[PDB]
Design a protein around this ligand. Structure first.
Ligand SMILES: Cn1c(N2CCOCC2)nc2cc(N3CCC(CO)CC3)c(NC(=O)c3cnn4cccnc34)cc21
Ligand SMILES: [Ca+2]
Length: 292
């Protein structure tokens, strides 16, 4: 649709030359992913987020350019309150930038870790974010898209903490197909996604890991933790050596045992090791509505 084509130099100006100091300290850097660093800027009185694309994981310059074109294509087709909105881009010279509507509360990953001293999210807000994120995935699946990169760093939060799915560079139009290029964040990936399969069933699995991060406040992976992988707590609970109560985030005072167990039951189902036994996104969405 109408995306503004900026010149790279204009984005160089709005981000104070992609100032690498964190925004918490007066710089412009907000964070980063496998495909680039994201910065704050102001364009014509509008606060914006600017991604300066870079192959920060093991992908080629040509693959990074295809991911750029793909994100624009997905954004032109998909608009929904639980999806990030693209405003523009720059593709002049050898640089690639994406310009988005700014998300005042950053990522769900950072809000769960209370990065930069932000207050812990209440259980009530955590439930609305889970619902919002499921509505976003539902919209994408309804519209024949597989996200392929679902994780709490890719769930953003606006001024009212409305969940906004981000990063559509790996998204694929959707019969299970295979790929030779296995790309993603291991800690969130379904076993079949780790084998190169492409299916919306893998989006559900990754959403299952997100639901565990919401309940526990723990990251999906921590090398200095036992177990290193959060998804492993499902087996510990099933083997009855632990309960979800032993893992619930202690940085909340409004979590009731009934809705916590209802969210865990949704997470446990999304995390079924066999893709065909997982619920589809419409079922995930109904269960999270019944929970509240
Ligand atoms: C304001 N703010 C803050 N605060 C500092 C702490 O106190 C609350 C406000 N941290 C933010 C982090 C991000 N991201 C950086 C990249 C990351 C990995 O991709 C995810 C989080 C954003 N980001 C956006 O506004 C954004 C908007 N569309 N978009 C698309 C892809 C990535 N980011 C965006 C804002 C932040
Ligand atoms: Ca003015």
């Amino acid at each position: 649709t109408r995306f503004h084509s900026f010149s790279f130099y204009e984005l160089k100006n709005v981000t104070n030359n992609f100032d690498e100091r964190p925004i918490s300290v007066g710089g412009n850097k907000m964070g980063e992913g496998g495909f680039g660093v994201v910065y704050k800027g102001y364009v014509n009185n509008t606060t914006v987020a600017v991604k300066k694309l870079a192959a920060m994981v093991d992908i080629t310059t040509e693959e990074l350019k295809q991911q750029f074109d793909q994100e624009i294509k997905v954004m032109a087709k998909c608009q929904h309150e639980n999806l990030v909105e693209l405003l523009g881009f720059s593709s002049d010279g050898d640089d690639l930038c994406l310009v988005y509507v700014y998300m005042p509360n950053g990522s769900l990953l950072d809000r769960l870790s209370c990065l930069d001293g932000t207050p812990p999210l209440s259980w009530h807000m955590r439930c609305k974010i889970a619902q919002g994120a499921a509505n976003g995935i539902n919209f994408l699946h309804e519209n024949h898209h597989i996200h392929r990169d679902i994780k709490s760093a890719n769930i953003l939060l606006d001024e009212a903490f409305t969940a906004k799915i981000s990063d559509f560079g790996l998204a694929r139009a959707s019969q299970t197909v295979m790929t030779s290029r296995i790309v993603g964040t291991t800690a969130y990936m379904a076993p079949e996604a780790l084998r190169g399969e492409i299916t919306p069933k893998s989006d559900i699995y990754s959403f299952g890991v997100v639901l565990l991060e919401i309940i526990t406040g723990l990251p999906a992976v921590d090398e200095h933790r036992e177990p290193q992988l959060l998804l492993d707590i499902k087996e510990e609970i099933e083997d009855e050596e632990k309960t979800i109560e032993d893992y619930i985030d202690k940085k909340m005072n409004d979590a009731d045992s009934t809705s916590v167990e209802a969210m865990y039951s949704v997470a446990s189902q999304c995390l079924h090791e066999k893709k065909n036994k997982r619920p589809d996104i419409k079922k995930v969405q109904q269960l999270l509505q019944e929970m509240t």
